[PDB]
Amino acid sequence: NHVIFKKISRDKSVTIYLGKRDYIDHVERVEPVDGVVLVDPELVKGKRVYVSLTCAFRYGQEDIDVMGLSFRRDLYFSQVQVFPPVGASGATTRLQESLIKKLGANTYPFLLTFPDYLPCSVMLQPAPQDVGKSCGVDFEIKAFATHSTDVEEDKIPKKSSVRLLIRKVQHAPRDMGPQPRAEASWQFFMSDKPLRLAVSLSKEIYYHGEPIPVTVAVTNSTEKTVKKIKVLVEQVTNVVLYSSDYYIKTVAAEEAQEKVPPNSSLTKTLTLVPLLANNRERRGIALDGKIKHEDTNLASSTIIKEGIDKTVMGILVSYQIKVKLTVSGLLGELTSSEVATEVPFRLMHPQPEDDENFVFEEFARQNLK
Ligand code: NA
């Protein structure tokens, strides 16, 4: 079985079919959006039909745009002619050949590539506590019909078009970086002896839903007790277009049950799983889609190609493990400050790997249960 997604214009003249809602970037390359457009021959007579792919950044709205009330900067734009048929006939892909075999003679292929310099789907709606507005990067697939008027004004009527917001989803590349690790030491006021914290991760990339084994070694040479060992996954978000908004938020947390007495060491591995489901509040963190939708995830770590300016990504997402130690008799007495350290890591979807029967679903995404 193969689920095909479809949407049809208010006026019934144009119907678009897609194989996926979600298009894979493994960063070596990215999936093209290939699909077909079914037309009503009678409603498209004398008309042209195109499909465009637009990547845009928007600040100030959850979409572009109501009352032109938002800032917008386009990252990429492409458009192909789907009807009348251009040049040679037939599909360039099996999906297309198959969908055309099934749907019949009013169906026409279209294929839209992605380039390698774009970000992946990212959006944020701010929490009450935050300032700065909603923003994100949208990927629009639009199929529309144009016609001519005797006044020589061409027309692109809304009722003849269909707009699908797809996702460009980040999947892991062939290779990952070295084992993440960090070593911090503190010498407190009046003290001759160090508190050391080493922290290590099993690998530099993790998959959404994959448990992250944070291993911690405390060497406490001090007279103090470490009352608490806390471990966080922090999501760090930078808005690099328009407003400068900066967000850092805890998407996962774990507390050890153990303390570290003066003059002792402790080594323990805590396991964290940074999912959006763990978060009651979905606001003020970078997601790959709208809050309302069941399929939405945490944004994957941004990946910038060499030689691309980061502002052109429009929102930067990155992750770190933060380990905070709580030290007895310090705070308000020997420090106004945290004792903590961070180890960065990347978070994305799994590495991808290396006729049929179709079932048609409406493209609109399922709302949150
Ligand atoms: Na001490």
From Swiss-Prot:
Classification via InterPro entries: Arrestin, Arrestin-like_C, Arrestin-like_N, Arrestin_C-like, Arrestin_CS, Arrestin_N, Ig_E-set
Alphabetical list of PROSITE patterns matching this protein: ARRESTINS
Domain of life where this protein originates: Eukaryota
Tissue expression summary: Detected in retina, in rod photoreceptor cells (at protein level).
Listed SMART domains: Arrestin_C
Keyword terms: Acetylation, Cell projection, Membrane, Phosphoprotein
Name this polypeptide is given: S-arrestin
Species this protein is from: Bos taurus (Bovine)
Gene: SAG
